[PDB]
Structure 1
Amino acid sequence: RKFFVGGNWKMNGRKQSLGELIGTLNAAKVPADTEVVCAPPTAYIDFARQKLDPKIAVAAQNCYKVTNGAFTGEISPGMIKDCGATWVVLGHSERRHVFGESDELIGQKVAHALAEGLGVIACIGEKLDEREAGITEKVVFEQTKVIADNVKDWSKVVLAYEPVWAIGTGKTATPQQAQEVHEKLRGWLKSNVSDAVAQSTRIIYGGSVTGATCKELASQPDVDGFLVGGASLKPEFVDIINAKQ
């Protein structure tokens, strides 16, 4: 599986500073068999795609589930493609848990974005109370099932595990804890989709990762890369791109 490093800029950046960040990223030497994707704020998708070299792909941070309509504040896959982006992040923990997006809606978005030709970074993960109740597997398997039920072509999908229980809670996820969930997710794909899909699908880690911790995380056998948050805004992101080196 090709190592996959996504940089989610979240709601950060202006043209001057994003241009600067893009210069640093363009200058990186992307190692062999490594796929890099950046997700700018929605107001800057087109801007970022124009400035980033095509060796780096661009993702929207979210989209809606139909191609046009009466949805003030939304964007559609068709608009993402028209701006030159080729991916979308769906189901991010902030959309689910700050903005209330349901599994049903996420599945509908996945189906539409994939049908329209985008790749999807599909995010899953259990919250604090779910972790404490012992239902990690039940939660992430149900989230992954909703995604899988809306996928026709698994070559267009990357799964991102976010340990929401260890983000803003006082809990720390260890590399062994991350690996344990990634292994369970891969086993779900084996039993519910196929062994081939399990073996080829990238499952990237969306918890805390820094230049100092990325090599150990990347060495976990079922961790196939990262969906990076805050470090994606800094030159340290290049070190994370090089986590397997």
Structure 2
Amino acid sequence: RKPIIAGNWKMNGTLAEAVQFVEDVKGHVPPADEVISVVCAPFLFLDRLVQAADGTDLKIGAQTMHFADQGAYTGEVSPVMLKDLGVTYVILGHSERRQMFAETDETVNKKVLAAFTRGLIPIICCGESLEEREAGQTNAVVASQVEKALAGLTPEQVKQAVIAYEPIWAIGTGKSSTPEDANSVCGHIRSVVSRLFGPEAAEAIRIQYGGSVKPDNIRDFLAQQQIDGALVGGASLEPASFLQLVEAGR
């Protein structure tokens, strides 16, 4: 399984800074065949970012999108628009959207289907909250989210899907899950995939860990058998930091 390290800038940056970032990084990123290097920037910057990253291994992703191809959805961006722009990845179901913008498992599922329909690789986010974790419902919660998100896909598509396990309590908190625990949950996710789509799909689908991943600990996560990469927020904002992250995928 080829590792995939994705940077989620969230709502940060200015066009100029976004371009400089890609500019300083696009050339020193590992070769595509060794690591999937992704930067998910704000909608406003995608156009120039795709332009700047053209002819390099740096891949550009969106932090979200709608499920419909077009329609009366003021403010939403469609997968058609993203594909057309040259965006290749899209983050779906990030806890931030599930918590504040009414993103549900149902809409995540619709978007996941829409992603594969429009040629975008989906990075599906799942994760338990502190309360769920403390109630020992982690596996059930994560299983349920993964099941509903992948519902309707063929095993061939699941192979290309990317699932990002991100315990909500670990996002931007400075408290990350231990590699062992994260590996266990990711192993459970892979197992859930295996029971839904077969061992072949589960052996190919890449599962990332996300939540306070830093260039000083990505290796610990990446080293785990069930963890194929990292979804990185805070530590993906600086070019130097980002480079260290993707570098660990080699």
Q: Same fold (TM over 0.5)?
A: yes
CA displacement, residues 134-177 of structure 1 (integer Å, 9 cap, x when unaligned): 11111111111112213231243111101113336685422222
Q: Give 1:197 shift.
A: 0.8
1:217 aligns with 2:218: no
CA displacement, residues 213-241 of structure 1 (integer Å, 9 cap, x when unaligned): 11111111111011111111111111111
CA contact (8 A) 2:209 2:227 kept: yes
Out of 130, 133, 140, which is 1:131 matched to?
133
The corresponding residue for 1:200 is 204
For 2:175 and 2:59, how far apart are their aligned partners in 1?
A: 33
What number of residue pairs does the alignment pair up? 245
1:120 aligns with 2:122: yes
The corresponding residue for 1:49 is 50
Moved more, 108-117 or 164-173: 164-173
1:71 corresponds to which letter in structure 2? Y
CA displacement, residues 108-155 of structure 1 (integer Å, 9 cap, x when unaligned): 111112112211111111111111111111111111111221323124
Q: Give 1:29 shift.
A: 3.9
1:226-237 pair list within 5 angstroms: 226-234=230-238, 235-237=240-242
The corresponding residue for 2:89 is 87
TM-score, with structure 2 as normaliser: 0.93
The corresponding residue for 1:40 is 41
CA contact (8 A) 1:122 1:158 kept: yes
1:3 corresponds to which letter in structure 2? P
For 2:196 and 2:159, how far apart are their aligned partners in 1?
A: 17
Q: Give 1:208 shift.
A: 1.2
1:27 aligns with 2:27: yes
2:3 corresponds to which letter in structure 1? F
Name the SS of the counterpart of 1:27 in structure 2: coil
CA contact (8 A) 1:182 1:223 kept: yes
For 1:167 and 1:49, how far apart are their aligned partners in 2?
A: 27
For 1:115 and 1:97, how far apart are their aligned partners in 2?
A: 26
Out of 150, 160, 169, which is 1:165 matched to?
169
Name the SS of the counterpart of 1:131 in structure 2: helix
CA contact (8 A) 1:108 1:150 kept: no
Name the SS of the counterpart of 1:221 in structure 2: coil
CA contact (8 A) 2:159 2:202 kept: no
The corresponding residue for 2:152 is 150
For 2:173 and 2:22, how far apart are their aligned partners in 1?
A: 32
TM-score, with structure 1 as normaliser: 0.94
Q: CA RMSD in A?
A: 1.6
For 1:209 and 1:103, how far apart are their aligned partners in 2?
A: 25
The corresponding residue for 2:100 is 98
CA contact (8 A) 2:175 2:212 kept: no
1:140 corresponds to which letter in structure 2? V
The corresponding residue for 1:11 is 11
CA contact (8 A) 1:219 1:244 kept: no
CA contact (8 A) 1:58 1:87 kept: yes
- 5+ long unaligned stretches in structure 2: none
CA contact (8 A) 1:161 1:203 kept: yes
